[PDB]
Design an enzyme around this catalytic site. Sequence first.
Site, mmCIF file in Angstrom:
data_model
loop_
_atom_site.group_PDB
_atom_site.id
_atom_site.type_symbol
_atom_site.label_atom_id
_atom_site.label_comp_id
_atom_site.label_asym_id
_atom_site.label_seq_id
_atom_site.Cartn_x
_atom_site.Cartn_y
_atom_site.Cartn_z
ATOM 1 N N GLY A 37 38.412 33.491 42.350
ATOM 2 C CA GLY A 37 37.881 33.829 43.675
ATOM 3 C C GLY A 37 38.576 34.999 44.350
ATOM 4 N N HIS A 107 45.540 23.560 39.729
ATOM 5 C CA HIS A 107 44.235 24.099 39.365
ATOM 6 C C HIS A 107 43.196 23.003 39.505
ATOM 7 C CE1 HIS A 107 41.089 24.624 36.307
ATOM 8 N NE2 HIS A 107 40.918 25.778 36.953
ATOM 9 N N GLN A 115 31.271 27.550 45.823
ATOM 10 C CA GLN A 115 30.808 27.695 44.440
ATOM 11 C C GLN A 115 29.963 26.538 44.001
ATOM 12 O OE1 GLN A 115 34.784 27.966 42.920
ATOM 13 N NE2 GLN A 115 34.815 30.212 43.053
ATOM 14 N N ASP A 152 41.734 27.224 59.113
ATOM 15 C CA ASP A 152 40.721 27.890 58.294
ATOM 16 C C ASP A 152 39.871 26.955 57.432
ATOM 17 O OD1 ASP A 152 39.248 30.186 57.351
ATOM 18 O OD2 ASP A 152 40.840 30.799 55.924
ATOM 19 N N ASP A 179 51.508 37.304 60.490
ATOM 20 C CA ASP A 179 51.882 38.499 61.258
ATOM 21 C C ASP A 179 51.888 39.782 60.424
ATOM 22 O OD1 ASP A 179 52.259 36.406 63.103
ATOM 23 O OD2 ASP A 179 54.330 36.959 63.628
HETATM 24 C C1 LIG Z 1 43.913 29.318 47.517
HETATM 25 O O1 LIG Z 1 43.867 28.346 46.448
HETATM 26 C C2 LIG Z 1 42.821 28.421 45.622
HETATM 27 O O2 LIG Z 1 41.878 29.155 45.795
HETATM 28 C C3 LIG Z 1 42.950 27.474 44.486
HETATM 29 C C4 LIG Z 1 43.978 26.599 44.195
HETATM 30 N N1 LIG Z 1 43.674 25.867 43.079
HETATM 31 C C5 LIG Z 1 42.445 26.263 42.637
HETATM 32 N N2 LIG Z 1 41.755 25.769 41.589
HETATM 33 C C6 LIG Z 1 40.537 26.287 41.356
HETATM 34 C C7 LIG Z 1 39.959 27.276 42.135
HETATM 35 C C8 LIG Z 1 40.670 27.775 43.217
HETATM 36 C C9 LIG Z 1 41.940 27.262 43.471
#
Ligand SMILES: COC(=O)c1c[nH]c2ncccc12
Length: 315
Positions: A37, A107, A115, A152, A179
């Site tokens: 991403g 992960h 998504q 967020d 900041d």
């Molecule tokens: C900001 O953290 C992430 O975007 C992610 C942290 N772990 C993930 N696992 C799959 C997809 C995005 C993420």
Amino acid sequence: ELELDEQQRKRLEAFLTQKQKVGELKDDDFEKISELGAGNGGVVFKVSHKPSGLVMARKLIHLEIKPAIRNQIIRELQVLHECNSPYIVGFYGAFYSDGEISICMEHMDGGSLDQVLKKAGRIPEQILGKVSIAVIKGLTYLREKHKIMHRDVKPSNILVNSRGEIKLCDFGVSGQLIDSMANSFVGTRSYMSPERLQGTHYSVQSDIWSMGLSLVEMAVGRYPIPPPDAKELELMFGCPMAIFELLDYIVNEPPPKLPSGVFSLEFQDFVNKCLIKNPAERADLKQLMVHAFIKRSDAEEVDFAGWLCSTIGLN
Ligand SMILES: COC(=O)c1c[nH]c2ncccc12
Ligand code: NA
């Protein structure tokens, strides 16, 4: 509401035990597998941490700043070693290397809800019930154990996995990293509460608005502002605005709502209580935890992983 069952206690213990085997994180220890991403001013990669053999997600934030600055950020990101919850993405560590800060996390194979939404088209009410619980419990954890709010909440900041887990990521933990990232881009403002867009009074109530907004988007399959026309609903259930114009709409117009005769009144009620513009009248975490929709979602035993794997084709 923060009490964990046997399976969640076990999974959390197995994560920490596994993390304890990982030492000091270093640039050269990582091998890129794929890309994930870029929704918050950085780039996320699925990586392999070579010595430990662990698969992680690595967020790279490209910043060109003097040694003094980066060292403070890294000390402030150490807060995350204390964030142990089944509703918060696991944190392995943070470091700086060749002009970029790395945040290494757990992960999540299901990816993010933006998504999952794109694939699915729209997410069913019962699935959104499970999401609602995890978001409320995650925000309750952040507020109770660490006296911090998310800031967020949005579909891309809610991560899912093949074990049916739902977790939050990308919450302001380092004042300095915030900041040092001023003048933006730190992510869209399209999920912000009217009160935050007015520069006024802001608490966890702003996070509840964002959650409510994200749920309507996922239930309908479209970012909800401006509301859809009678014709756009006939397409969806049988049965372009510039960012500045959109932010004005949030502050000046009545909040979005779920279409009737498609969703349960309990779900319609629940989103409405999140979407009340006055943060004082708006429901809070304690009120949301005993809402009819939340109690019913808890008693529902929904196969979230089963639904997830079929929808995104995981396998
Ligand atoms: C900001 O953290 C992430 O975007 C992610 C942290 N772990 C993930 N696992 C799959 C997809 C995005 C993420
Ligand atoms: Na993000």
